[PDB]
Design an enzyme around this catalytic site. Structure first.
Site, PDB file in Angstrom:
ATOM      1  N   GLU A 215      -3.063  15.234  19.273  1.00 30.13           N
ATOM      2  CA  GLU A 215      -3.486  15.805  17.980  1.00 30.13           C
ATOM      3  C   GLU A 215      -4.926  16.135  18.026  1.00 30.13           C
ATOM      4  O   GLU A 215      -5.452  17.240  17.443  1.00 30.13           O
ATOM      5  CB  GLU A 215      -3.279  14.584  16.647  1.00 30.13           C
ATOM      6  CG  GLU A 215      -3.851  14.969  15.461  1.00 30.13           C
ATOM      7  CD  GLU A 215      -3.465  13.877  14.400  1.00 30.13           C
ATOM      8  OE1 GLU A 215      -2.199  13.660  14.477  1.00 30.13           O
ATOM      9  OE2 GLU A 215      -4.374  13.855  13.615  1.00 30.13           O
ATOM     10  N   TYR A 216      -5.789  15.221  18.508  1.00 28.96           N
ATOM     11  CA  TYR A 216      -7.347  15.641  18.655  1.00 28.96           C
ATOM     12  C   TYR A 216      -7.486  16.572  19.654  1.00 28.96           C
ATOM     13  O   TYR A 216      -8.731  17.706  19.320  1.00 28.96           O
ATOM     14  CB  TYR A 216      -8.103  14.426  19.499  1.00 28.96           C
ATOM     15  CG  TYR A 216      -8.314  13.309  18.471  1.00 28.96           C
ATOM     16  CD1 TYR A 216      -7.695  12.710  17.306  1.00 28.96           C
ATOM     17  CD2 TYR A 216      -9.640  12.722  18.624  1.00 28.96           C
ATOM     18  CE1 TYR A 216      -8.036  11.659  16.416  1.00 28.96           C
ATOM     19  CE2 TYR A 216     -10.123  11.658  17.629  1.00 28.96           C
ATOM     20  CZ  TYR A 216      -9.364  11.106  16.649  1.00 28.96           C
ATOM     21  OH  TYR A 216      -9.491  10.277  15.715  1.00 28.96           O
TER      22      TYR A 216
ATOM     23  N   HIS B  42       0.646  10.651  21.359  1.00 31.93           N
ATOM     24  CA  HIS B  42       0.746  11.565  20.164  1.00 31.93           C
ATOM     25  C   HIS B  42      -0.535  11.780  19.572  1.00 31.93           C
ATOM     26  O   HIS B  42      -1.347  13.004  19.321  1.00 31.93           O
ATOM     27  CB  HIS B  42       1.635  11.182  19.325  1.00 31.93           C
ATOM     28  CG  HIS B  42       1.982  11.951  17.772  1.00 31.93           C
ATOM     29  ND1 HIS B  42       0.788  11.531  17.193  1.00 31.93           N
ATOM     30  CD2 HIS B  42       2.370  12.758  17.432  1.00 31.93           C
ATOM     31  CE1 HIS B  42       1.325  12.356  15.876  1.00 31.93           C
ATOM     32  NE2 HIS B  42       2.335  13.087  16.280  1.00 31.93           N
ATOM     33  N   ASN B  43      -1.305  10.642  19.128  1.00 25.79           N
ATOM     34  CA  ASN B  43      -2.790  10.854  18.235  1.00 25.79           C
ATOM     35  C   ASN B  43      -3.614  11.399  19.081  1.00 25.79           C
ATOM     36  O   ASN B  43      -4.634  12.076  18.674  1.00 25.79           O
ATOM     37  CB  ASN B  43      -3.196   9.539  17.933  1.00 25.79           C
ATOM     38  CG  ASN B  43      -2.412   8.806  16.523  1.00 25.79           C
ATOM     39  OD1 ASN B  43      -1.608   9.400  16.070  1.00 25.79           O
ATOM     40  ND2 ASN B  43      -2.659   7.626  16.231  1.00 25.79           N
TER      41      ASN B  43
ATOM     42  N   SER C 142       4.536   8.500  12.404  1.00 23.97           N
ATOM     43  CA  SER C 142       3.656   9.520  12.165  1.00 23.97           C
ATOM     44  C   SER C 142       4.239  10.058  10.795  1.00 23.97           C
ATOM     45  O   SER C 142       5.108  10.045  10.027  1.00 23.97           O
ATOM     46  CB  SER C 142       3.839  10.526  13.205  1.00 23.97           C
ATOM     47  OG  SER C 142       3.864   9.760  14.358  1.00 23.97           O
ATOM     48  N   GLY C 143       3.148  11.078  10.169  1.00 27.28           N
ATOM     49  CA  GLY C 143       3.423  12.075   9.259  1.00 27.28           C
ATOM     50  C   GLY C 143       2.698  11.615   7.809  1.00 27.28           C
ATOM     51  O   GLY C 143       3.153  12.083   6.829  1.00 27.28           O
ATOM     52  N   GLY C 144       2.127  10.363   7.748  1.00 27.27           N
ATOM     53  CA  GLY C 144       1.390   9.921   6.731  1.00 27.27           C
ATOM     54  C   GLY C 144       2.026   9.445   5.615  1.00 27.27           C
ATOM     55  O   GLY C 144       3.136   8.970   5.747  1.00 27.27           O
TER      56      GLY C 144
ATOM     57  N   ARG D 262       0.912  -9.206  -0.112  1.00 27.55           N
ATOM     58  CA  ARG D 262      -0.067 -10.209  -0.324  1.00 27.55           C
ATOM     59  C   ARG D 262      -0.861 -10.376  -1.892  1.00 27.55           C
ATOM     60  O   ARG D 262      -0.641 -11.422  -2.414  1.00 27.55           O
ATOM     61  CB  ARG D 262      -1.190 -10.282   0.534  1.00 27.55           C
ATOM     62  CG  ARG D 262      -2.200 -11.371   0.235  1.00 27.55           C
ATOM     63  CD  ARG D 262      -3.307 -11.337   0.990  1.00 27.55           C
ATOM     64  NE  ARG D 262      -4.184 -10.189   0.783  1.00 27.55           N
ATOM     65  CZ  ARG D 262      -5.119  -9.747   1.687  1.00 27.55           C
ATOM     66  NH1 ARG D 262      -5.580 -10.260   2.634  1.00 27.55           N
ATOM     67  NH2 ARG D 262      -5.748  -8.513   1.334  1.00 27.55           N
ATOM     68  N   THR D 263      -1.072  -9.215  -2.395  1.00 26.80           N
ATOM     69  CA  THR D 263      -1.563  -9.166  -4.013  1.00 26.80           C
ATOM     70  C   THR D 263      -0.228  -8.821  -4.718  1.00 26.80           C
ATOM     71  O   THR D 263      -0.081  -7.736  -4.985  1.00 26.80           O
ATOM     72  CB  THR D 263      -2.887  -8.162  -4.205  1.00 26.80           C
ATOM     73  OG1 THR D 263      -3.812  -8.538  -3.123  1.00 26.80           O
ATOM     74  CG2 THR D 263      -3.333  -8.293  -5.309  1.00 26.80           C
TER      75      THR D 263
ATOM     76  N   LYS E 202       2.905   6.625  20.622  1.00 21.71           N
ATOM     77  CA  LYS E 202       2.153   7.064  19.210  1.00 21.71           C
ATOM     78  C   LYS E 202       1.029   7.474  19.496  1.00 21.71           C
ATOM     79  O   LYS E 202       0.155   8.235  19.178  1.00 21.71           O
ATOM     80  CB  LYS E 202       2.354   5.990  18.286  1.00 21.71           C
ATOM     81  CG  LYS E 202       1.812   6.046  17.188  1.00 21.71           C
ATOM     82  CD  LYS E 202       1.998   7.530  16.102  1.00 21.71           C
ATOM     83  CE  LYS E 202       1.370   7.359  14.705  1.00 21.71           C
ATOM     84  NZ  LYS E 202       1.087   8.650  14.264  1.00 21.71           N
TER      85      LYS E 202
ATOM     86  N   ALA F 249       0.801  -1.171  -0.087  1.00 20.10           N
ATOM     87  CA  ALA F 249       0.059   0.006  -0.089  1.00 20.10           C
ATOM     88  C   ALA F 249       0.844   1.107   0.095  1.00 20.10           C
ATOM     89  O   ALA F 249       2.039   1.138   0.271  1.00 20.10           O
ATOM     90  CB  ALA F 249      -0.888   0.186   1.346  1.00 20.10           C
ATOM     91  N   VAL F 250       0.366   2.392  -0.179  1.00 19.68           N
ATOM     92  CA  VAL F 250       1.139   3.511  -0.352  1.00 19.68           C
ATOM     93  C   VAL F 250       2.086   3.811   0.898  1.00 19.68           C
ATOM     94  O   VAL F 250       3.408   4.187   0.747  1.00 19.68           O
ATOM     95  CB  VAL F 250       0.439   5.048  -0.387  1.00 19.68           C
ATOM     96  CG1 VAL F 250       1.393   6.253  -0.848  1.00 19.68           C
ATOM     97  CG2 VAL F 250      -0.534   5.001  -1.553  1.00 19.68           C
TER      98      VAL F 250
HETATM   99  N1  LIG Z   1      -5.374  -9.965   6.222  1.00 18.58           N
HETATM  100  C1  LIG Z   1      -4.320  -9.746   5.516  1.00 18.58           C
HETATM  101  N2  LIG Z   1      -3.232 -10.829   5.428  1.00 18.58           N
HETATM  102  C2  LIG Z   1      -2.220 -10.137   4.530  1.00 18.58           C
HETATM  103  N3  LIG Z   1      -2.006  -9.081   4.182  1.00 18.58           N
HETATM  104  C3  LIG Z   1      -2.905  -8.010   4.302  1.00 18.58           C
HETATM  105  C4  LIG Z   1      -4.178  -8.462   4.910  1.00 18.58           C
HETATM  106  N4  LIG Z   1      -4.824  -7.426   5.263  1.00 18.58           N
HETATM  107  C5  LIG Z   1      -4.134  -6.317   4.590  1.00 18.58           C
HETATM  108  N5  LIG Z   1      -2.783  -6.760   4.227  1.00 18.58           N
HETATM  109  C6  LIG Z   1      -2.118  -5.905   3.613  1.00 18.58           C
HETATM  110  O1  LIG Z   1      -1.887  -4.654   3.875  1.00 18.58           O
HETATM  111  C7  LIG Z   1      -1.862  -3.428   3.155  1.00 18.58           C
HETATM  112  C8  LIG Z   1      -3.290  -2.795   3.306  1.00 18.58           C
HETATM  113  O2  LIG Z   1      -3.398  -2.043   4.567  1.00 18.58           O
HETATM  114  P1  LIG Z   1      -4.794  -0.862   4.739  1.00 18.58           P
HETATM  115  O3  LIG Z   1      -5.787  -1.843   4.685  1.00 18.58           O
HETATM  116  O4  LIG Z   1      -4.347  -0.458   6.362  1.00 18.58           O
HETATM  117  O5  LIG Z   1      -4.526  -0.016   3.645  1.00 18.58           O
HETATM  118  C9  LIG Z   1      -1.986  -4.090   1.762  1.00 18.58           C
HETATM  119  O6  LIG Z   1      -0.545  -4.306   1.199  1.00 18.58           O
HETATM  120  C10 LIG Z   1      -2.555  -5.710   1.954  1.00 18.58           C
HETATM  121  O7  LIG Z   1      -2.084  -6.468   0.840  1.00 18.58           O
HETATM  122  P2  LIG Z   1      -3.164  -6.567  -0.341  1.00 18.58           P
HETATM  123  O8  LIG Z   1      -2.749  -5.444  -1.279  1.00 18.58           O
HETATM  124  O9  LIG Z   1      -2.845  -7.984  -0.746  1.00 18.58           O
HETATM  125  O10 LIG Z   1      -4.528  -6.335   0.123  1.00 18.58           O
END
Ligand SMILES: Nc1ncnc2c1ncn2[C@@H]1O[C@H](COP(=O)(O)O)[C@@H](O)[C@H]1OP(=O)(O)O
Ligand SMILES: NC(=O)c1ccc[n+]([C@@H]2O[C@H](COP(=O)([O-])OP(=O)(O)OC[C@H]3O[C@@H](n4cnc5c(N)ncnc54)[C@H](OP(=O)(O)O)[C@@H]3O)[C@@H](O)[C@H]2O)c1
Ligand SMILES: O=C(CO)[C@H](O)[C@H](O)COP(=O)(O)O
Lengths: 470, 469
Positions: free
Chosen positions: A192-193, A188-189, A129-131, A35-36, A185, A13-14
């Site tokens: 922020e609130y 911290h959050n 932190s920091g997105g 995973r994907t 952390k 993910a990002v």
């Molecule tokens: N149940 C899970 N098992 C393995 N990887 C996961 C699972 N749920 C989320 N992920 C992975 O965590 C990241 C997403 O996090 P968020 O939901 O906080 O954005 C993605 O890379 C996702 O992979 P994938 O791209 O295969 O779904």
């Protein structure tokens, strides 16, 4: 491709991706897994010139990493992370270091840290932190875990961390064992609130009482930010007040529904403070402020039935704008005093020896709550590491004394005019309570003994007492 | 020796009396307690009564007529878990087990599921009213399956307080599994509010109007003649009377300002945070308790942190009425908050809580017994789906007439440096609840700005993001 990579990241993910890119840019080979696969692969093609190592299965990934293996997990908090952890455990070796940089609830980390120590595996719960922008360029980071394992991770974290503009000090330092990182952390959050609500209340006052215009309100925050308040959040506020609506006439700020964002994780700091017996009115007032705002439908209905004063302002604008500014800073101080006292209590409970002054230093950059006055918090702890409460230190003693009057008038003005300031009023109540030598808790104490014989203590002799009310 | 009709475990204040209540209805009552010594200490004194003294759980359980009806009044958590664990083997299909303590509702919810199809009838019940309540007639909040409930209703009705307006027993069915204990936790939640609102008024009177205990005891007397008429105000002037049993001066001055707390108030707030329910006032009183345990730093901070020492120079009797209004007003805020949480909780857990009934059974044998509860019942008879109590006429009126006064009390108290956390909470809540527009707009804007979190619009449906760059 076997044992080539210095550091690894799971989760493309990002956030993870950005982190992997950050780490890569500091001079490392970095293995990425998701995973994907089409996400991993998608990342590989966009960044082929980088030294990323593409991996299809856990096996390939674990197999690609130098030993001790340093693996950062950036997956979904909760069941997902435990799932991921379970998938890696077989393939790992003793002494390998797993790192969870997700927005994890501290007990999860405390549990995982302990489980894996039995399997030989080190576990660093780390707040990031920091997105997405920080993850790529410079996050503020709050790691906790085995200190020995962390020392081996620290160099990278320190190279990728945000650098404080006042001294280029990395916004990362060891918090303590097990889950101390994720706990810092959290606070911290929470904090922020508080800030966000405190700004909201300031804005609301100028807008409603002083009938100020967005443009007028911009100028004020602009000025205020030149002074002691100086904070990225205030800088965000004057930035948002500039912007035109993208789908109509006027300002985007006036078009954004007043319903606050899903809970969510922001309640945790307050849950912990309730749990540890720590007074945290401010941040908890901020949370409910969010909550009550999600009751928009109800509020509309109530707006038409419930009476409020229809006062019309006649004082001096310049005088009030400056009293609110003092109110803002005084209240902000109250929030940190509470939040830092929470940390101090959690540090006893869990035995963490939390570095309070550094926490403030590593909040100076790469996060939301970054502000100039954070230094004063460090100063305070430098003077006395064992300082019970920020209020009791020369700097905050002074600010409160010279500023308390203004709060009071800001309180009276708002309350009289019927403008809702939950956190302002709360700040001044925390104040007057904390300094009150005696509290009417004596009466509560009497009541409970009367109806339920819960027993009280006496002011004159040690021991446990039950008066005979009947 | 299967003699007894009912059985009470745990012979501390609550279990002791409860067993005496049941006895006074003309039954014979098994008494067990883990510490043998107190069982015998209760048997020995109350020889005259029909108490069956037992020493082992197997005895006590054998000594109950079938189906056995057993009611625990033991300390909550570990203490209760182990007591029930011991018991289950000893019991027979068709028996009735009652957890009458302040059990955190999830414990009960889980217990109910566990025990459901093992043929033992389980009730999780709240009991209010303290020692006198338990002795003479308490408020009861039974939850569990309806068939379970229906077996204990006859005796619950008999031991329950009776509402003075209509003689209707202060016990009713709350709902499935944990509904009951949950209800009692909200009872205690509201209780902490009332008490902190009471304490704050004590402070205001004692510290700004510089009034003596007799002067204040007199004020709480007169108040309890009005619409404030309530158990807590009553026990206040009762307290303000009593003199130190070990020295000169009033007892209420020799008790240390450090509030004990036993979980229930904290649990309400936890549930509010958990459900998205705005519960400022009760949470403020929980924290008022917390900050009172910080005596040591309060002593330290009193000598360093400056503040107003400005004398009160206005009309005393005028400002006393003003406080009475604010006290009434704020109590109303609390109950509004309490009832809305119950609404949200009800729909979370598929309980279908009888909001009106809950007010009805709170009229007596109840720490938050108050005359103005009837008004809450009207409000729900009038519309069971009422969203917040503040919307109902009777309360629309009171707020309209008292809000100006509240504001003055809040202003005076802040300018006089006297800490009124729950009082400030009351007007803030009211002022937020009645705003068509809150500054959440700015907050949301911020969230979208630094974190891309998206937002809703005022003029059209859908979720939107703003390209802030
Ligand atoms: N149940 C899970 N098992 C393995 N990887 C996961 C699972 N749920 C989320 N992920 C992975 O965590 C990241 C997403 O996090 P968020 O939901 O906080 O954005 C993605 O890379 C996702 O992979 P994938 O791209 O295969 O779904
Ligand atoms: N007091 C009130 O105003 C009030 C009102 C409503 C509800 N309640 C609830 O009613 C229940 C009990 O009433 P209480 O407040 O009078 O008493 P309590 O002090 O909360 O509980 C003490 C009772 O539990 C037993 N107990 C304590 N620890 C135990 C352990 N570790 N293992 C087994 N048994 C243990 C005690 O036996 P020993 O004699 O051996 O210590 C005693 O009988 C509690 O759950 C309470 O929350 C109290
Ligand atoms: O349930 C009760 C009355 O309603 C008990 O008296 C309870 O223990 C009082 O609450 P706490 O001890 O937490 O102040």
């Amino acid at each position: 491709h076997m044992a080539q990579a210095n550091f690894g990241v799971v989760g493309m993910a990002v956030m993870g991706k950005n982190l992997a890119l950050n780490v890569e840019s500091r001079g490392y080979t970095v293995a990425i897994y998701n995973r994907t696969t089409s996400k991993t692969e998608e990342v590989f093609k966009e960044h082929q010139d980088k030294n990323l190592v593409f991996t299809k299965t856990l096996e390939e990934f674990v197999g690609s990493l130098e030993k001790p293996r340093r693996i950062m997990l950036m997956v979904q908090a909760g069941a997902a992370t435990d799932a991921t952890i379970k998938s890696l455990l077989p393939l790992l070796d003793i002494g390998d270091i797993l790192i969870d940089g997700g927005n994890t609830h501290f007990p999860d980390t405390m549990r995982r840290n302990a489980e894996l120590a039995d399997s030989g595996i080190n576990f660093i719960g780390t707040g990031v932190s920091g997105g997405e922008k920080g993850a790529l360029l410079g996050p503020s980071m709050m790691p906790g875990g085995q200190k020995e394992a962390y020392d081996l991770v620290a160099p990278i974290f320190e190279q990728i961390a945000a650098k404080a503009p006042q001294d280029g000090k990395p916004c990362v330092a060891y918090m303590g064992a097990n889950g101390a990182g994720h706990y810092v952390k959290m606070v911290h959050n929470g904090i922020e609130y508080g800030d966000m609500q405190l700004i909201a209340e300031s804005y609301d006052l100028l807008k409603r009482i002083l009938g100020l215009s967005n443009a007028e309100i911009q100028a004020i925050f602009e000025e205020w930010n030149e002074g002691e308040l100086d904070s990225y959040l205030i800088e965000i506020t004057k930035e948002v007040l500039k912007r035109k609506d993208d789908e109509g006439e006027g300002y985007i700020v006036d078009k954004i529904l007043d319903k606050a964002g899903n809970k969510g994780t922001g309640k945790w700091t307050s849950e912990s403070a309730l749990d540890l017996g720590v007074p945290l009115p401010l941040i908890t007032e901020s949370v409910f402020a969010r909550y009550i705002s999600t009751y928009k439908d109800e509020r509309v209905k109530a707006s038409k039935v419930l009476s409020g004063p229809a006062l019309d302002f006649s004082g001096d604008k310049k005088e009030v704008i400056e009293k609110i500014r003092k109110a803002l800073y005084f209240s902000k101080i109250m929030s940190y005093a509470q939040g830092f006292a929470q940390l101090r209590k959690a540090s006893e409970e869990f035995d963490w020896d939390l570095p309070y002054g550094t926490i403030a230093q590593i909040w100076r950059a790469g996060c939301i709550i970054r502000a100039e006055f954070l230094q004063n918090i460090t100063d305070a702890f430098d003077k006395d590491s064992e300082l019970e409460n920020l209020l009791l230190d020369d700097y905050f003693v002074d600010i409160t004394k010279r500023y308390q009057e203004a709060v009071r008038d800001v309180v009276s003005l708002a309350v009289q005019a019927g403008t809702p300031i939950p956190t302002f009023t709360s700040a001044i109540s925390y104040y007057d309570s904390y300094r009150s030598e005696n509290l009417p808790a004596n009466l509560i104490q009497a009541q409970r003994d009367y109806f339920g014989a819960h027993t009280y203590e006496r002011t004159d002799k040690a021991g446990i007492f039950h008066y005979d009310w009947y």
